[PDB]
Design a protein around this ligand. Structure first.
Ligand code: MG
Length: 425
RNA sequence: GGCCAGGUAGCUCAGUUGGUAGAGCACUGGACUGAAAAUCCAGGUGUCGGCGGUUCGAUUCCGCCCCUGGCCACCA
């Protein structure tokens, strides 16, 4: 299979001129310090796919700290060195960020061994990457500038739309990929080929998913839910039995599946009308239903979660069937008010996950009715001017006139107020 | 530097239809007992992190900061 290709034309045509000049300069610097310079990762992939990619990952063969320190004087900005893994991050004044890493054999020799055929060193660095499409590099050195370097066939997999791991232990080294793969499947329209699907299933069933830290898995989950087709992602994780390994007490049934369908269907509506909605907590709302205190404590400790989330969830699971019967009997909005009263948008999404069709339209209508229709006059300071006073009572009265206003009867103010006061006797 | 969480008495911590402060312990004495391991009934605790805003009124609703913890900052 063909390894090297010429992307130079694609480079100059597609890439932003600023980033391009940065590439040129970095390559030249590399020639000056006798270090081969590459740009690697998602940038290459997106470059082939015609997608804008801001973050740039540079891989040099040599000391990356020396290369960065060398490129700092010529490039305005702030250098942050981490001497652990020999990596540096150079923040340019333009707002761009350059990530520079070291490619070396962990033995090698000094001075730097000259270029070897097939470029073993950089190959060794690209073998550690997750998927073939992210395993490709591009040489920035002026002589070789615009050289696409693909050992593992990431180009072929890019044309055929294939998600493929590098080796059999890929999911063992970084089980987070189990999620990421799925995300990629939904990021583009791509398919996970047979072997890595087997490797994924094996990885999940062997409990490598639980070994990894919570926050990373939560991060990849959040990234998954912000992609284009969340439903297909959730169902994909369901196929691989990922959901129960992430959340032990969550069992994915056709009922829960339908809930997720309604949920993702109604999320754009809530986001439109009620504003920004966290999709992670929106999904956990359905997932974490009927969790006992122990399990909730564990799942909250693993992936850090709001301590008040379980209260909202339990509120929903408390008022859901009653809500169903309310919408079934065409009950006035005054009775549906206390349930959705002070709740978060995520809670509202959860409620919407329980219904479709006529009940959906009705609940949305009542929702928009509650969102609007707030107040005109009277309330507290004006009730001070009147017979009542001193605390809770007047607030109760407020809720009364609000309820009479939500029942469909609205004319003016003190008329409804007088009705309420007459009913207080 | 990025992200996710917390701050409630001296300590560890609960508390959402906004509506006047909560539990165990820290803390003392006595009954039984020469004394103790011990249990019994028990004597009062708050700028609810800081500050604006909405409300008659905010620990709560919201925005901006202070502080603590965790994840991450080769691969990721
Ligand atoms: Mg980067």
């Amino acid at each position: 299979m063909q390894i090297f290709r010429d992307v130079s034309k694609l480079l100059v045509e597609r890439v932003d001129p600023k980033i391009l000049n940065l590439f040129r300069l970095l390559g030249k610097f590399g020639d000056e310090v006798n270090m081969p310079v590459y740009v690697v990762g998602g940038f290459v992939r997106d470059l082939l796919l015609g997608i804008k990619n801001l973050d740039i990952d540079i891989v040099v063969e040599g000391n990356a700290l020396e290369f960065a320190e060398y490129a700092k004087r010529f490039l305005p900005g702030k250098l942050v060195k981490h001497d652990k893994f020999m990596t540096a991050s150079l923040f340019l004044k333009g707002g761009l960020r350059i990530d520079i890493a070291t490619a070396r054999l962990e033995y090698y020799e000094s001075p730097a061994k000259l270029p070897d055929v097939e470029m073993s060193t950089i190959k060794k660095d690209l073998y550690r990457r997750d998927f073939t499409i992210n395993a490709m590099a591009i040489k920035l050195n002026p002589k070789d500038f615009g050289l696409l370097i693909d050992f593992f066939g990431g180009y072929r997999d890019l044309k055929e739309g294939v998600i493929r791991v590098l080796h059999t232990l890929s999911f063992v080294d970084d089980p987070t990929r189990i999620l990421r793969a799925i995300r990629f499947e939904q990021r583009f329209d791509f398919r996970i080929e047979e072997t890595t699907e087997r490797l994924l299933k094996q990885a999940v069933e062997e409990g490598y998913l639980e070994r990894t830290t919570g926050p990373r898995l939560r991060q990849e989950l959040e990234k998954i839910l912000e992609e284009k087709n969340p439903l297909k992602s959730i169902r994909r994780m369901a196929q691989f039995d990922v959901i129960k390994h992430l959340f032990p007490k969550t069992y994915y049934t056709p009922s829960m599946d339908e809930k997720m369908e309604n949920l993702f269907r109604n999320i754009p509506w809530v986001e439109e009308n009620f504003g920004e909605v966290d999709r992670f907590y929106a999904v956990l709302h359905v997932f974490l239903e009927f969790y006992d205190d122990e399990s909730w404590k564990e799942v909250r400790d693993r992936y850090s979660l709001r301590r008040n989330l379980i209260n909202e969830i339990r509120h929903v699971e408390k008022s859901a069937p009653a809500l169903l019967e309310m919408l079934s009997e065409r009950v006035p909005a005054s009775f549906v008010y206390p349930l959705v009263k002070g709740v978060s948008n995520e809670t509202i999404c959860h409620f919407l996950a329980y219904l479709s069709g006529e009940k959906e339209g009705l609940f949305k209508s009542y929702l928009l009715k509650i969102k609007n229709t707030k107040l005109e006059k009277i309330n507290g300071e004006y009730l001070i001017r009147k017979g009542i006073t001193s605390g809770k009572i007047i607030g109760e009265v407020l809720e009364k006139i609000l309820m009479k206003k939500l029942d469909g009867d609205t004319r003016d103010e003190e008329e409804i107020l007088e009705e309420v006061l007459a009913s207080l006797e």
